[PDB]
Amino acid sequence: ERIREHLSSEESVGLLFSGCTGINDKTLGARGGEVIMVTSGSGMGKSTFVRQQALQWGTAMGKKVGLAMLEESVEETAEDLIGLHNRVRLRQSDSLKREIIENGKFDQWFDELFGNDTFHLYDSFAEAETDRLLAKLAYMRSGLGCDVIILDHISIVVSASGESDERKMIDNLMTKLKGFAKSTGVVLVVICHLKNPDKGKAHEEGRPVSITDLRGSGALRQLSDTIIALERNQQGDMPNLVLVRILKCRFTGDTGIAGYMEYNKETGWLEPSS
Amino acid sequence: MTYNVWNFGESNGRYSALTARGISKETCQKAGYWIAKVDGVMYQVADYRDQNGNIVSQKVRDKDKNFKTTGSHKSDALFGKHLWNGGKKIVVTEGEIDMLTVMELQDCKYPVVSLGHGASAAKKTCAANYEYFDQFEQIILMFDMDEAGRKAVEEAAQVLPAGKVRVAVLPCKDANECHLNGHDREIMEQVWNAGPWIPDGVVSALSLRERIREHLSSEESVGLLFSGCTGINDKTLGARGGEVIMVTSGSGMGKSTFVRQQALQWGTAMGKKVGLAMLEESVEETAEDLIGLHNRVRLRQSDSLKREIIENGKFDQWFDELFGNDTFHLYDSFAEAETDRLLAKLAYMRSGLGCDVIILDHISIVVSASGESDERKMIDNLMTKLKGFAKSTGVVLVVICHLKNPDKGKAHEEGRPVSITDLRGSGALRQLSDTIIALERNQQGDMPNLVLVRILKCRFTGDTGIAGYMEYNKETGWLEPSSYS
Amino acid sequence: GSHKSDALFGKHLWNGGKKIVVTEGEIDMLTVMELQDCKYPVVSLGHGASAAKKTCAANYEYFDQFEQIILMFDMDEAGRKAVEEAAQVLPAGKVRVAVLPCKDANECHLNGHDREIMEQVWNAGPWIPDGVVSALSLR
């Protein structure tokens, strides 16, 4: 009976990765209980890729998405979603900001987006303790009833914290996040950064990213079920061209390069091909 | 269905002292808190008057601490609201007895208010009273010190005027529990020392739309404009408050000269209060550069002219012309500052002196917690604290770092575009910093004064690459914009 | 008796006013009152220069009755630290630091410099260390 109930409801194709495909061809979406790992270099598209998925899922397939943008205030993150939804770089314009305010178009777009109460976020920025996030991440999942939790940046370093080498902190945290993800069945999307090789041209100038290039003592390479990686050469002749590489997919096992995408400097989207 | 307003001269009313609470008669009389003797019982009535004195609602309790409401107890119910027309700080308690505690200790001379519908409607009550609470510079959220109390604090800070939120943490249950115990010493300092921080950490389901509108109106997206070369503005749209600008180049190529132009430019044309942290030079030397830079000259190479124009009356002229607006602030030590012997001072500018831009030249002078192997963590640890400070205050922070020595081919001074990997420190600064400006020039080429500007990162826009070019005017010491391709 | 941390020598003499002088030693508090004919608010610190932060913090409510708080501490290495640790827990906008040509207030009086003491009660605010000196005062 539980498998019948499982097979009938389980969003196994639930919330397919938008912006590009081949990712769907190699991962078949994001299952509930899996931990999706998104990574790239600094300023390449970790936040932007994940931000499209959070927007898309909570609109087209309408899901209660939980956000944890620990590096930016919620008004800034909402600011992106509003512009991203309306295909504009609203953050990148004083005219567009002044426009929608004075002519009352701001309220218009906002109700069109958040009007479902499908978007829930985390607001603090000032140091989130490990079990002072998991409680709130669960509060979304459980109290607010979210289907997807989005955790930007898996660090919160700063603190000493009394235990040398935070290589265990990232490991200890990832396990509980996988636990939380599975015991509730919530799709868990987390963003991590990449180590510094300093051993040739690196990341921002190209270079494929392997699982070893992942920050931390690769525990995230174990607990996570699927690993999405973005690669682009911001000094190349197409700095907006970004390559998607699957480093892991516990569900399928089909790895390799999925497809390509192009950063539309007008809409702020990652349109597939061009 | 709601009760009728009790009358003071019709229900055995008297203004007695709450001896078992620690509140005297004089205090009860001023807040409008009296005791009624109806049916032989002993009820305590809290008069929630409006801006006129007319009782609107009342909150009546007896021996067993049961609640009974009379009148029109609307969502904006604030016990003591009628006593204060505004000011500097306002204390927001949970219960009326706690509101009676602060006034007793402050001799009923300072604004203190209580919540109408307990800790539950804290969010709604504070939301209903946004217009009123914004007449004060600070809002002292001293709720109960329990599980439910901290959630009420959480739901309060969400719908309160941004930047004015402050939370009190008492060694006991509530304000009254401290008073009757010992701790009259522990309450008041936290009324004047409570932490000015954020809600943390749910804060979901929009509810901030209008505040984002309020936000978008006050902090622009073309925050400031880097002068010296257009194109930097095209790819970064300036430097917002709360961002971290990262400026770097080779040694003696114009890290200091480039940044100093922006500090000068911003503090003159756009009259912003610029804070300087020139760790590798006395305050007089950085001022010396600024003085010459403002007057399009170099007061470091013309040596006869230095002694001349100063002792003649052209120094005092330029000095008042430049620093007279009281905008420029610098750091004076050179005696190896400690990390939390800089951030304290850097915050003092931003906060005490009120600066808009803080400039930290050279971020490799750590000098902090000696004994830990590799300063690779110190630079990372510092950047985290700098980013926190930068965003939590909304200050523009421009920091200068240096570049690792590659020794793998011709390096930096001979050209060589500097990538993000070439950045000094275990690239944590490539993460915490939002915008990264890099200067490149071949000081052994046909165009040494020609400098290439390269954006290595801009979390705001995401538009990277080569901006434009500039030329070092040896006469003016400026970075004039060039026409090169 | 009970030397609580809010010990302020002379606190019982004033109920607010325009300005109040906060010395370190009671003897220095006796100097300022001597020059002012005991007509203007002058107080001393209970626990010396060490608990300067705690004593001033304990009397923030009291010191907040005045428009200005004249920190006339000693003029040594420890004295300047006491100025630093007091001014942190004092009302921002009511500080001011006294700089004497001698050791303390009494050392000036016994020498010549009554001409340096009272006048130096009128001098701005900043506060606290390292400057930062808003350029203008670096001329």
mmCIF file of all heavy atoms in Angstrom, chain A residues 116-144:
data_model
loop_
_atom_site.group_PDB
_atom_site.id
_atom_site.type_symbol
_atom_site.label_atom_id
_atom_site.label_comp_id
_atom_site.label_asym_id
_atom_site.label_seq_id
_atom_site.Cartn_x
_atom_site.Cartn_y
_atom_site.Cartn_z
ATOM 1 N N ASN A 116 0.158 33.804 -4.994
ATOM 2 C CA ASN A 116 -0.205 32.458 -4.576
ATOM 3 C C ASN A 116 0.270 32.125 -3.172
ATOM 4 O O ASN A 116 -0.103 31.068 -2.651
ATOM 5 C CB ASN A 116 0.374 31.417 -5.536
ATOM 6 C CG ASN A 116 -0.206 31.519 -6.920
ATOM 7 O OD1 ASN A 116 0.522 31.723 -7.892
ATOM 8 N ND2 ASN A 116 -1.521 31.369 -7.026
ATOM 9 N N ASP A 117 1.075 32.989 -2.557
ATOM 10 C CA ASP A 117 1.772 32.660 -1.319
ATOM 11 C C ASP A 117 2.560 31.363 -1.496
ATOM 12 O O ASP A 117 2.572 30.479 -0.635
ATOM 13 C CB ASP A 117 0.800 32.576 -0.139
ATOM 14 C CG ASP A 117 1.505 32.603 1.201
ATOM 15 O OD1 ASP A 117 1.879 33.704 1.655
ATOM 16 O OD2 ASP A 117 1.677 31.520 1.800
ATOM 17 N N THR A 118 3.215 31.250 -2.648
ATOM 18 C CA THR A 118 4.054 30.103 -2.961
ATOM 19 C C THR A 118 5.525 30.344 -2.664
ATOM 20 O O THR A 118 6.339 29.443 -2.887
ATOM 21 C CB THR A 118 3.897 29.709 -4.433
ATOM 22 O OG1 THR A 118 3.858 30.889 -5.249
ATOM 23 C CG2 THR A 118 2.631 28.894 -4.636
ATOM 24 N N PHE A 119 5.892 31.526 -2.174
ATOM 25 C CA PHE A 119 7.289 31.863 -1.946
ATOM 26 C C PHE A 119 7.503 32.236 -0.487
ATOM 27 O O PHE A 119 6.797 33.093 0.055
ATOM 28 C CB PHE A 119 7.730 32.991 -2.879
ATOM 29 C CG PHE A 119 7.679 32.610 -4.328
ATOM 30 C CD1 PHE A 119 6.648 33.048 -5.144
ATOM 31 C CD2 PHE A 119 8.655 31.793 -4.867
ATOM 32 C CE1 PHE A 119 6.605 32.681 -6.477
ATOM 33 C CE2 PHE A 119 8.617 31.424 -6.191
ATOM 34 C CZ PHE A 119 7.593 31.867 -6.999
ATOM 35 N N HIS A 120 8.488 31.588 0.127
ATOM 36 C CA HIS A 120 8.855 31.746 1.523
ATOM 37 C C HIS A 120 10.372 31.792 1.593
ATOM 38 O O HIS A 120 11.049 31.045 0.881
ATOM 39 C CB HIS A 120 8.292 30.586 2.364
ATOM 40 C CG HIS A 120 6.802 30.437 2.275
ATOM 41 N ND1 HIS A 120 5.951 30.865 3.271
ATOM 42 C CD2 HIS A 120 6.009 29.934 1.297
ATOM 43 C CE1 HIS A 120 4.701 30.619 2.919
ATOM 44 N NE2 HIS A 120 4.708 30.056 1.725
ATOM 45 N N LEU A 121 10.912 32.667 2.440
ATOM 46 C CA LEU A 121 12.346 32.939 2.444
ATOM 47 C C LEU A 121 12.893 32.912 3.865
ATOM 48 O O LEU A 121 12.158 32.721 4.837
ATOM 49 C CB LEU A 121 12.658 34.291 1.792
ATOM 50 C CG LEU A 121 11.955 34.654 0.487
ATOM 51 C CD1 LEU A 121 10.632 35.363 0.754
ATOM 52 C CD2 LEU A 121 12.875 35.522 -0.345
ATOM 53 N N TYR A 122 14.213 33.064 3.958
ATOM 54 C CA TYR A 122 14.953 33.199 5.208
ATOM 55 C C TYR A 122 15.606 34.575 5.222
ATOM 56 O O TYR A 122 16.282 34.947 4.258
ATOM 57 C CB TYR A 122 16.014 32.095 5.343
ATOM 58 C CG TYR A 122 16.900 32.200 6.569
ATOM 59 C CD1 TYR A 122 16.658 31.417 7.688
ATOM 60 C CD2 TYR A 122 17.987 33.066 6.599
ATOM 61 C CE1 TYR A 122 17.460 31.507 8.808
ATOM 62 C CE2 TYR A 122 18.794 33.160 7.713
ATOM 63 C CZ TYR A 122 18.528 32.378 8.815
ATOM 64 O OH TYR A 122 19.332 32.470 9.928
ATOM 65 N N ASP A 123 15.418 35.327 6.305
ATOM 66 C CA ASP A 123 15.954 36.684 6.405
ATOM 67 C C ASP A 123 16.757 36.830 7.688
ATOM 68 O O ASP A 123 16.189 36.804 8.785
ATOM 69 C CB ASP A 123 14.845 37.732 6.360
ATOM 70 C CG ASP A 123 15.381 39.146 6.494
ATOM 71 O OD1 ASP A 123 16.484 39.411 5.966
ATOM 72 O OD2 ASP A 123 14.711 39.991 7.125
ATOM 73 N N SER A 124 18.069 37.012 7.547
ATOM 74 C CA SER A 124 18.930 37.298 8.685
ATOM 75 C C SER A 124 20.281 37.841 8.232
ATOM 76 O O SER A 124 20.693 38.923 8.670
ATOM 77 C CB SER A 124 19.131 36.046 9.541
ATOM 78 O OG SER A 124 19.889 36.343 10.699
ATOM 79 N N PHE A 125 20.976 37.086 7.375
ATOM 80 C CA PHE A 125 22.306 37.416 6.865
ATOM 81 C C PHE A 125 23.377 37.325 7.953
ATOM 82 O O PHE A 125 24.470 36.806 7.705
ATOM 83 C CB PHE A 125 22.309 38.807 6.207
ATOM 84 C CG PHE A 125 23.685 39.336 5.890
ATOM 85 C CD1 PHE A 125 24.409 38.835 4.818
ATOM 86 C CD2 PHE A 125 24.246 40.347 6.657
ATOM 87 C CE1 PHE A 125 25.674 39.322 4.526
ATOM 88 C CE2 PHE A 125 25.508 40.839 6.371
ATOM 89 C CZ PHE A 125 26.222 40.326 5.303
ATOM 90 N N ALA A 126 23.071 37.802 9.162
ATOM 91 C CA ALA A 126 24.054 37.902 10.246
ATOM 92 C C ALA A 126 24.187 36.554 10.951
ATOM 93 O O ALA A 126 23.605 36.307 12.009
ATOM 94 C CB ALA A 126 23.667 39.009 11.220
ATOM 95 N N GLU A 127 24.976 35.670 10.332
ATOM 96 C CA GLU A 127 25.432 34.419 10.935
ATOM 97 C C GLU A 127 24.295 33.472 11.304
ATOM 98 O O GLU A 127 23.659 33.637 12.349
ATOM 99 C CB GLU A 127 26.272 34.698 12.189
ATOM 100 C CG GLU A 127 27.286 35.830 12.073
ATOM 101 C CD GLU A 127 28.522 35.454 11.280
ATOM 102 O OE1 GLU A 127 28.610 34.305 10.794
ATOM 103 O OE2 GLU A 127 29.409 36.321 11.144
ATOM 104 N N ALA A 128 24.053 32.460 10.476
ATOM 105 C CA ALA A 128 23.066 31.432 10.783
ATOM 106 C C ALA A 128 23.766 30.223 11.399
ATOM 107 O O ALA A 128 24.576 29.567 10.735
ATOM 108 C CB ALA A 128 22.299 31.027 9.525
ATOM 109 N N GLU A 129 23.457 29.934 12.661
ATOM 110 C CA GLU A 129 23.994 28.749 13.316
ATOM 111 C C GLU A 129 23.400 27.490 12.687
ATOM 112 O O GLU A 129 22.308 27.515 12.113
ATOM 113 C CB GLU A 129 23.704 28.796 14.821
ATOM 114 C CG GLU A 129 24.582 27.895 15.686
ATOM 115 C CD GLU A 129 24.064 26.472 15.772
ATOM 116 O OE1 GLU A 129 22.870 26.257 15.478
ATOM 117 O OE2 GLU A 129 24.852 25.567 16.122
ATOM 118 N N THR A 130 24.139 26.379 12.793
ATOM 119 C CA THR A 130 23.759 25.150 12.097
ATOM 120 C C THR A 130 22.350 24.696 12.454
ATOM 121 O O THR A 130 21.486 24.569 11.577
ATOM 122 C CB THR A 130 24.762 24.036 12.397
ATOM 123 O OG1 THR A 130 26.084 24.445 12.015
ATOM 124 C CG2 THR A 130 24.352 22.746 11.705
ATOM 125 N N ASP A 131 22.089 24.443 13.738
ATOM 126 C CA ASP A 131 20.732 24.108 14.151
ATOM 127 C C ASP A 131 19.925 25.344 14.514
ATOM 128 O O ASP A 131 18.970 25.248 15.295
ATOM 129 C CB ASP A 131 20.752 23.136 15.330
ATOM 130 C CG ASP A 131 21.483 21.852 15.012
ATOM 131 O OD1 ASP A 131 21.467 21.417 13.839
ATOM 132 O OD2 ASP A 131 22.050 21.259 15.955
ATOM 133 N N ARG A 132 20.252 26.490 13.920
ATOM 134 C CA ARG A 132 19.379 27.655 13.914
ATOM 135 C C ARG A 132 19.004 28.001 12.482
ATOM 136 O O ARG A 132 18.506 29.094 12.197
ATOM 137 C CB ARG A 132 20.079 28.827 14.609
ATOM 138 C CG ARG A 132 19.193 29.976 15.036
ATOM 139 C CD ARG A 132 18.739 29.788 16.472
ATOM 140 N NE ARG A 132 18.514 31.067 17.137
ATOM 141 C CZ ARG A 132 17.440 31.827 16.954
ATOM 142 N NH1 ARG A 132 16.480 31.439 16.124
ATOM 143 N NH2 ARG A 132 17.325 32.978 17.601
ATOM 144 N N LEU A 133 19.225 27.048 11.584
ATOM 145 C CA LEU A 133 18.791 27.060 10.199
ATOM 146 C C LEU A 133 17.951 25.831 9.904
ATOM 147 O O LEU A 133 16.832 25.951 9.393
ATOM 148 C CB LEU A 133 20.010 27.121 9.259
ATOM 149 C CG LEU A 133 19.729 27.344 7.773
ATOM 150 C CD1 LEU A 133 19.136 28.724 7.563
ATOM 151 C CD2 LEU A 133 20.989 27.163 6.948
ATOM 152 N N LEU A 134 18.463 24.648 10.263
ATOM 153 C CA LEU A 134 17.733 23.398 10.083
ATOM 154 C C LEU A 134 16.358 23.445 10.732
ATOM 155 O O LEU A 134 15.391 22.887 10.199
ATOM 156 C CB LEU A 134 18.544 22.241 10.670
ATOM 157 C CG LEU A 134 19.432 21.442 9.720
ATOM 158 C CD1 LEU A 134 20.795 22.102 9.577
ATOM 159 C CD2 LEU A 134 19.565 20.017 10.216
ATOM 160 N N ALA A 135 16.248 24.091 11.895
ATOM 161 C CA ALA A 135 14.937 24.275 12.507
ATOM 162 C C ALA A 135 14.032 25.099 11.600
ATOM 163 O O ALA A 135 12.877 24.734 11.351
ATOM 164 C CB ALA A 135 15.085 24.937 13.877
ATOM 165 N N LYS A 136 14.553 26.213 11.087
ATOM 166 C CA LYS A 136 13.777 27.089 10.219
ATOM 167 C C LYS A 136 13.543 26.456 8.851
ATOM 168 O O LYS A 136 12.463 26.610 8.268
ATOM 169 C CB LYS A 136 14.489 28.431 10.109
ATOM 170 C CG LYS A 136 14.848 28.957 11.482
ATOM 171 C CD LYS A 136 15.488 30.317 11.449
ATOM 172 C CE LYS A 136 15.826 30.749 12.863
ATOM 173 N NZ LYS A 136 16.543 32.042 12.907
ATOM 174 N N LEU A 137 14.547 25.756 8.314
ATOM 175 C CA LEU A 137 14.347 25.036 7.062
ATOM 176 C C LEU A 137 13.242 24.004 7.222
ATOM 177 O O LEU A 137 12.425 23.804 6.315
ATOM 178 C CB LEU A 137 15.647 24.353 6.631
ATOM 179 C CG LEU A 137 16.883 25.192 6.297
ATOM 180 C CD1 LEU A 137 18.053 24.281 5.944
ATOM 181 C CD2 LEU A 137 16.615 26.181 5.183
ATOM 182 N N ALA A 138 13.196 23.348 8.385
ATOM 183 C CA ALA A 138 12.122 22.405 8.667
ATOM 184 C C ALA A 138 10.812 23.141 8.894
ATOM 185 O O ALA A 138 9.745 22.650 8.515
ATOM 186 C CB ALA A 138 12.478 21.541 9.877
ATOM 187 N N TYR A 139 10.878 24.323 9.514
ATOM 188 C CA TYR A 139 9.670 25.106 9.753
ATOM 189 C C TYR A 139 8.987 25.452 8.440
ATOM 190 O O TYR A 139 7.756 25.531 8.371
ATOM 191 C CB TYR A 139 10.008 26.378 10.529
ATOM 192 C CG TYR A 139 8.850 27.342 10.644
ATOM 193 C CD1 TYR A 139 7.637 26.935 11.186
ATOM 194 C CD2 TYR A 139 8.962 28.653 10.201
ATOM 195 C CE1 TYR A 139 6.573 27.808 11.295
ATOM 196 C CE2 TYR A 139 7.900 29.536 10.306
ATOM 197 C CZ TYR A 139 6.708 29.106 10.854
ATOM 198 O OH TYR A 139 5.644 29.974 10.963
ATOM 199 N N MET A 140 9.771 25.682 7.391
ATOM 200 C CA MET A 140 9.207 25.912 6.072
ATOM 201 C C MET A 140 8.539 24.625 5.601
ATOM 202 O O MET A 140 7.314 24.571 5.466
ATOM 203 C CB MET A 140 10.287 26.378 5.090
ATOM 204 C CG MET A 140 10.878 27.745 5.423
ATOM 205 S SD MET A 140 12.024 28.380 4.178
ATOM 206 C CE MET A 140 13.346 27.184 4.278
ATOM 207 N N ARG A 141 9.354 23.608 5.307
ATOM 208 C CA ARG A 141 8.873 22.264 4.986
ATOM 209 C C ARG A 141 7.672 21.795 5.810
ATOM 210 O O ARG A 141 6.688 21.292 5.256
ATOM 211 C CB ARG A 141 10.026 21.268 5.140
ATOM 212 C CG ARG A 141 9.614 19.825 4.928
ATOM 213 C CD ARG A 141 8.916 19.658 3.592
ATOM 214 N NE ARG A 141 8.617 18.263 3.291
ATOM 215 C CZ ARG A 141 7.991 17.858 2.192
ATOM 216 N NH1 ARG A 141 7.593 18.744 1.288
ATOM 217 N NH2 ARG A 141 7.759 16.567 1.996
ATOM 218 N N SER A 142 7.735 21.931 7.135
ATOM 219 C CA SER A 142 6.692 21.375 7.997
ATOM 220 C C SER A 142 5.598 22.394 8.319
ATOM 221 O O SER A 142 4.419 22.158 8.041
ATOM 222 C CB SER A 142 7.316 20.832 9.289
ATOM 223 O OG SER A 142 8.310 19.859 9.012
ATOM 224 N N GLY A 143 5.977 23.524 8.921
ATOM 225 C CA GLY A 143 4.991 24.525 9.301
ATOM 226 C C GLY A 143 4.378 25.230 8.105
ATOM 227 O O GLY A 143 3.154 25.298 7.968
ATOM 228 N N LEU A 144 5.225 25.771 7.227
ATOM 229 C CA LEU A 144 4.749 26.501 6.063
ATOM 230 C C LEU A 144 4.349 25.571 4.926
ATOM 231 O O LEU A 144 3.631 25.996 4.014
ATOM 232 C CB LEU A 144 5.825 27.477 5.578
ATOM 233 C CG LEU A 144 6.102 28.690 6.472
ATOM 234 C CD1 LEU A 144 7.300 29.475 5.967
ATOM 235 C CD2 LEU A 144 4.877 29.587 6.556
#
